[PDB]
Structures are given as C-alpha cells and as structure tokens.
Design a binder for these strands. Structure first.
Ligand SMILES: [Mg+2]
Lengths: 95, 87, 106, 97, 97, 82, 95, 106
DNA sequence: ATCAATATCCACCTGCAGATACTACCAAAAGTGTATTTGGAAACTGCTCCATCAAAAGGCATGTTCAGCTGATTCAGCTGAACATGCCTTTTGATGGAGCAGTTTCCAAATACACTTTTGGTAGTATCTGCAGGTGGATATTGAT
DNA sequence: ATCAATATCCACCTGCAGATACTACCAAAAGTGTATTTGGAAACTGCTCCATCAAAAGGCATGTTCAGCTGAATCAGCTGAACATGCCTTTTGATGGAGCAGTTTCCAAATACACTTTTGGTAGTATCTGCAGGTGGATATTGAT
C-alpha cells in the first residue's frame, strides 16, 4: 500500500503563516507540490553541473547559492540568497 | 474480447464552436473561415509529438497503460511543463 | 533531539531534502549546508506564491486558494512569470487582456 | 426583431472566456482523437483518465497561447481577422519551424 | 557619371554576406562594450581572448537570426523595410518579451 | 571626440548583420533598436558568465564561463570547448 | 600540462573511413568535438531520467535506446538504433 | 589484451565512454552494453555529419573541411537541422536565401 | 534596340599559416584477473480503476441575412539608398606582469554503520463548510430612431 | 438624446462535494552516536597569455540628391458574425474485469579492488601543403539613352 510523499503539510504550514484564514484546494495543493519539485530539480541540476565544471565531487551550500543566482530572476534571487544564507548560519550555530 | 470500433476522422470532433471559444480565450475578435482546418492540422501535430514521446515512456516501462506521468514527462521533454497532474 | 529543520528555523523538511539530493545522483557528496540552504530557498519561494495567491483569492471574495488564484498570482508578477515562463498551470486560464484596436468606436 | 452588431457578441465572448478556466473542447471527442492518434503509434493501449485530461490541459493552453501570438501577427498586418498566414508566421517565429 | 539604383547594392551585399562567415562587428568596439557591461557585475575583470570571441560569435548569430524573423514580420505587413515594430513583434513571439 | 561604447556598434556594422539576415531595406530607427537588443542580450549572457567566474574564484572570464552561460540560456555554441 | 582529452583522433579516423582524401581544420574539429560532447550529454541525460522514472539503479542499453528514440528525428533514430544494436551484438559474440 | 572498441567494431572509444558514464552521475550503475551502444550512436552521427560536410567541401572545390562546410551540411539536411535547431556553429554563416518579394522586377 | 561602366568570373601563381607526421615519455587510462555485493526478472496474487455500457442533459449544425472588413487602386510626399575620401579609429604586432593552473599538504567534514527514537503517510470512520449553481429581481449596456 | 431589448450584476439560498477532523497504528524515515576516509582549501610559484601601447592599416562619418517605398484615402465586393431553428451527441452514474503494482524469492551481472599493459596527449623538433590573395583577361549585368 505504497507511501507517496508530498510537500503538502509544509506548504500548508507556510500558508497558515501568511494567510491564517485562507484554505487551499487539493488541485491547488497538487500544483504547489509540482512547483516545489520542479524548482528543487532545477536548482539541484545547476548545482550538479556547476560542481562538475569545477572538478568537485561535493555539492555544498555554495553550489546551491550560485545555482540560485543562475536560476532565479533579480529580486527573487537576492531574497532567496538571504533566506538560505541565514538558514545555514543559524544551522551552523545550532549544534 | 469480441470486436472493437474503428477510430477515424476524430479530428472533426474539434468543432468550429470549440475552436472559436479557444480563440476567444486567446483574445481573438474575428476569425477567417480557413482557420478551423489550419487549427485542426496544428493540433494534430502537437498531439502526435506529445503522444509519441508519452507512448515511448509507456513502452519502456513495459506497460499497456499510458499514465498521467508518461504525459507529464513527455511534456517536460518538449519544454511545455505542466503542473496539476503529479508532475 | 531537535530536527535539522527547527535547528535552521525552517518549516520545510531538511531531512527529506538531504535524502532527495542523495538519491538524485547530482554528485558524489552532499555538504550538510546544501539541504539547509535548498530547503530555505524552497520555503521562501512557496511563501512568495502563497502570499500573492492568497491575495487573488481575497480579491475574488474567496477563502480557498484554487488553481485560478495561483495563475493570477504568477502571471501578474514579473519575476514569478519569468521563472515559470515555460510552465502550465492546469485549470488556471489566462489574464483578461484585449488588444486596443479590437475595442469599438474610436 | 433585435440584433447586436458584428463584433459586439465577439467581445462579450472574449470577456467571458478570459474570465473562466473550464476546458473549452468537449471531453469525449478529445478522448477519441487521443486514442486514434495513439493507436496509429501502437495498438492495444489503454489510458488513465488523468492522462487524457493532462493532454487536454496542455493542448488547450498551447492553442490559446498560439492564438494570442496569431492575433498579434494579424494586428501587425493592420487587420483584426486572424488568417492561416498569421498562424504560420507565429509558428515560424516560435521555431516550430 | 554612373549610379546604381536603390536596392541594387543592397541585394549585392545580401549575396556577399550570405556567402562569407567573418564577423561583421569590429573587434575592438565590441570588446569595449563587453567590458563595460561586465563592470556592472564585477569590477577589475579580465577576459580570455577566446571568451570575447565566443561572445561575439554568439551575439552575431543571434542578431542575424533575429533580422531574418524581423524581415518575415515586415513582409507579413506587406513592406520591404524593417522597422522597430518588426523587431518588437519577433521578440514578443519568440518569448523574449 | 568622446563616444559611448554602444555607439561603437556602428550603422554599417548593423547594416552588414541585417544583410546576412537577408534584409534589403532598413529604417533609420533600426540602428538604435538593435543596440538596445544587443545590450539586453549581452547583459543576460555576461551576467551568467561572470557568475560562473566568481564561483571559480577567478578574475578572468574564460571561454568556458561564456560557453556554459550560452548553454543555459538555450543558445549552445560549438567551437570554443565543452 | 594537465591532460586535455578530446574525440579528435576518433573523429579523424571516421573522417578517413568516410572521405579518405578529405582533411579537417582545427576549428571544424573543435566543433565536431563539441557536437560529440553535446550529443553524449543529451543521450546520457535522458537515459538517466528513464532509469530514475522506472525505479532502476542501472543505465542499460535499453535506456540508451529509448533515449535515442526520444531525442533523434525519425530516420536518424532508426539508423542510430540499428548501429547501436549492431555494435552490442558484435561485442557479445566476441571472445 | 584486445580493446572493447575493436571488439565492438568501432572507432569510438568504448572504455572512455564507459568511464564518462560512470563519473557523470547518471545512475548508481552502468550496464556493460550501454557504453558500447552509446559509442556506436556517437560514431554514427559523426560519420553522418562528416559524410555531408565532406560533400560540401567537394562542391566548393576544397579538400579541407572548415566550419562553413559543417554549417552547410547541417542546415541543408532536415534531420540534422532539427537535432541542432538550437545550436550555433561558430564561423558557419547562413544559407544563401533571399525572399522572393525582395527580388527586382523583371 | 546600342553602349559603356563596372561587377563578376575563372585560370594560373605562390608564401606561409596552419596542417600533419614522428619520436621518446611518462602519467594515466584502459584492460585483465578474483573476491564480493546487489539489482531486477519471474512468479504469484491482492485489488485499483479502466473499458464499457444505459439514461439523462444541453450544445451543435445549418441557412439566412447584411455589416463592415479586406484588399485593390491610386497618389503624394517622406525617407532611406547611393555616392566619394581623408580623418581617425581599429588592427597589428612587440613586450612587461597578472593570474591561472599544477603541486603538495593535512584536517574539517565527508561517508559509513548500527541500534533508537520520531513522524509523515493512510486508513477507517466521523462531522464540517465553502461555494457552485439556482433563483428572482434591481442596474447597465447596446443599438434603433 | 429617449425608448426598449437583453445582458449583467448582486444578493440571498439550498445541497453537497470536497475538505478538514481523530483515533489508531506503523514502516520507514530521521535522528543520534561513534568509528574511518578524504576532498578541497590553503600556500607557494612557474609560465602562459592578457592589457597595454607604437606603428601601421584601411573602414567609416559625412551631406547631397532623388528613386521608390510607405501610408493615407477611397470604395466595391463579399466574407464572416449574428441568430433562428431543429435535434444529435455528450455527459453523467452505474458495474464486471484487465493489468498495475506490491511483496519475496533467487541468480546473472556489476562493483571493487589490485596488478600489468597500453595508448593517447604533449612536447620538442622538424616537415609538409591547401588555399587565400593577387594578377590578367574574358564576359555578364546594370543602367542610361
Ligand atoms: Mg488508425
């Protein structure tokens, strides 16, 4: 009765934070799930390529960061870069 | 199985009113009479291309059933990514 | 036992993302910061779209976000539009837009 | 007996269809076309119903966006009527040729 | 006193430039422009010689192909003269706008 | 005799490009439109190339930086490596 | 100093089989090398996706074959397929 | 020792192709025949282009294939043109082609 | 028509930039042998959901009518093509130095591995609610006059 | 402008499909903790190959003139929009059954070393040559009369 993972519950958490009284249909949730998977694959891919081009066998937050700059337009890139830097910085100090 | 109906000329099931509606959605105000056959032709090519790749994925998987995912991957390959169907 | 998500102050699942980076054949090795940074980018991006879609739902006197709302959100935003410029949102329709010369009189 | 002028109902329909999101091609006819085309590639295939719906959403979004490009090509020619030459120009510039 | 008619040399030039493959922008001015544009992304950059070449080749291929589409757009409107609206239409349909 | 760098892309040069593109007759406003288009093109490509340069910790944009930038813009080039 | 690998020699061999009196400039050879690299990446890329879609851990000639069918136009695909099958047969029936 | 290329009847290097598949993060594992097949495909397409480019050299009174010849070969062939429809061959120029409406009136 | 200006074609000549052939070399594949891990076909079988069908609901096909759009025709005036050359920018080459790239180094962070906790997905049964689609009934919008 | 046909706009209104709610469980995540390997940063450095500039090359800015193209105006013809009418086809709900997919057993094939052999790339040096330019002479094209 095989288990199918989705980002649904996390999309819902983030939805409650931004619009606490707003719901999402299952179809809109399905599109949100496709959007996350799609962006995931596009960043991982660039990071993959980037690592290879520089003869590196490791994908680090640095590769992800360049991938984000290559992938996202102007202002989304700038903000994504702060959000991910911030999360890593916080993460490093937290063990 | 005993018998299975012959499929022919189903392109004409894409009617003049259906096509006119699509044009309306695309902001078209006036439509020449020749647009309907041209559009049918264009749609046929589009479907042939996507179905071919979709069916290729199906056969590679050794299935007899074309899945939503076969179509979604076929669309992604052709740079017409679709969200809404598990893809 | 604090999840790597709570450690990075994230809603999105760092563990899941680390795993997906491994099974995905992207490189020999995955750095520990990679899934942290990636999960935040992903969370940010989805926050951005739910904000905008939430607004379209409200603008439409609706409480539930449906696919039309996501499409209005994406197409009305220059940057999301470009990011998803070769993507189709099923049941999203189009933006109302009629070319000038098509309108009546003068 | 009452009559709207040519163009008036047309703009009404544009507002109506730009407002909504339902599929504009009838389901069964579309489903038959899919099966016909697929059968010519390979006999004895089945389809998940969502596979057919996926093709329909993709084909309708493709045709709507092509008609917008076509409309722009007409207007470029100082017309308001789309013709086969407009579609052909759109497809050529798109690199579908 | 001898004079060629308008379009005679133009045709002669189309033939000439369609025959050859040399770059048609002067190297230096192109190199300056490239450097100017790069300075806004990072300062004190150097360029491999082949790096500038690669950019020139790509930029000239792009512009040459855009002029073909532009020309089709002018002809669609029943002119023989390319105008900014023709370049604009070609870019909009290409999905660059 | 100070001149903008973009203006270094001269009328005759743009004329030659048009010619290779099979263009017979050219409107006066085309030269400025073309410069604008070239500038957007080079911005998009150089932006990505430099981004590759910075990632490698170089101060030199390499042919490969450019070739990779072109590939991801959907404008693959052959002739310069890769 | 570090080794720069290339398909140059193998491309040159094929040139002589196909046109024994024709040569090739450096620039043209460099293009041919890019072509081979590009097609490799496209085909391996697709084969990768195919294996992953089907929850398989191995890229086999079946995946290469399907990739070729997905990437090459009609007649080009047909020959590539038969050239490929042909090579895999000769390789099997060889001690 | 007899090379895998010679075994498979190929000029293109099976060992190299096999290696490149391994270190390309394409999958956890690479089957024995896959590099053989792939090498054959790559050799074949190479021959196809060198065949037609050689011919274009011949037509232009030359024995050395230059980029111009690779360009003429690719764009005059419907299939190679489609495969390379988003590729630019440096120093290739374009096919001689003038729209009929631009020709002088006889 | 003829006629002359000038562009274009082709045969032959040649110097050298760019191709090719060669030897000795060494790091680095690529291949061969043997010990070990595992991925995936096959065989069986629970069970989703697809093909198929009968009734019910609404869109399609067709012909008539004429509004107004397209495409042909003509025309004047604007706007780009063609034209000749010395100024001035670019090309070409000669020369110091920035930095790219190759080498060794050593440890922070990577993989691996094994019991231990947590959780996200489902599955079965339950109650909840946003809104689609129906209505009637007040306010535009459109087109004749 | 005024009158009237018909589309449009809410506002309220019932059913219900789809969404949210829990209680119970559980396989597989994810975490934790420790032993074992290593990728890549960091530091020094040799030699490309890059920015600069002096001398040579040779393309382009320039304003004039007018061919011929673009766009405005006008208009006949006919195509395509609107709408009436008659009714076929699709939509929707219901039900046996193919094949997808879940689990488990079992071997042919692939990974993982290490060791043994070779080939492909670089480099030094010298060697070869296809063809880009240049010339010279016939012939085609274009534009004028
Ligand atoms: Mg058939």
């Amino acid at each position: 009765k095989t288990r199918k993972e989705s980002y649904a519950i996390y999309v819902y958490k983030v939805l409650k934070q931004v619009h606490p009284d707003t719901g999402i249909s299952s179809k809109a949730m399905s599109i949100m799930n496709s959007f996350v998977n799609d962006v995931f694959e596009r960043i991982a891919g660039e990071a993959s390529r980037l690592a290879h081009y520089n003869k590196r066998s490791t994908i680090t937050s640095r590769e992800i960061q360049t991938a984000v700059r290559l992938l996202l337009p102007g202002e989304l890139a700038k903000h994504a870069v702060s959000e991910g830097t911030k999360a890593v910085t916080k993460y490093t100090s937290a063990k | 199985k005993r018998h299975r109906k012959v499929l022919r000329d189903n392109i004409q099931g894409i009617t003049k009113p259906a096509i006119r509606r699509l044009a309306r959605r695309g902001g078209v105000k006036r439509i020449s009479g020749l647009i309907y056959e041209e559009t049918r032709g264009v749609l046929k090519v589009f479907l042939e291309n996507v179905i071919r790749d979709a069916v290729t994925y199906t056969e590679h998987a050794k299935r007899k059933t074309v899945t939503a995912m076969d179509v979604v991957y076929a669309l992604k390959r052709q740079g017409r990514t679709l969200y809404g169907f598990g893809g | 036992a604090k999840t790597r998500s709570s450690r990075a102050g994230l809603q999105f699942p760092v563990g899941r993302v680390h795993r997906l980076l491994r099974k995905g054949n992207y490189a020999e090795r995955v750095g520990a910061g990679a899934p942290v940074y990636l999960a935040a980018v992903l969370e940010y991006l989805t926050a951005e779209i739910l904000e905008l879609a939430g607004n379209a739902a409200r603008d439409n006197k609706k409480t539930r976000i449906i696919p039309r709302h996501l499409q209005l959100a994406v197409r009305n935003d220059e940057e999301l539009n470009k990011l998803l410029g070769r993507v189709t949102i099923a049941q999203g329709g189009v933006l109302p837009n009629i070319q000038s010369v098509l309108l009546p009189k003068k | 007996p009452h009559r709207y002028r040519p163009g008036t109902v047309a703009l009404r329909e544009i507002r109506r269809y730009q407002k909504s999101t339902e599929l504009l091609i009838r389901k069964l006819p579309f489903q038959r076309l899919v099966r016909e085309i697929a059968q010519d590639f390979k006999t004895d295939l089945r389809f998940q119903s969502s596979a057919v719906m996926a093709l329909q959403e993709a084909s309708e979004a493709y045709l709507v966006a092509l008609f917008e490009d076509t409309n722009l090509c007409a207007i470029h020619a100082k017309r308001v009527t789309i013709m086969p030459k407009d579609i052909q120009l759109a497809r050529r510039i798109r690199g579908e040729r």
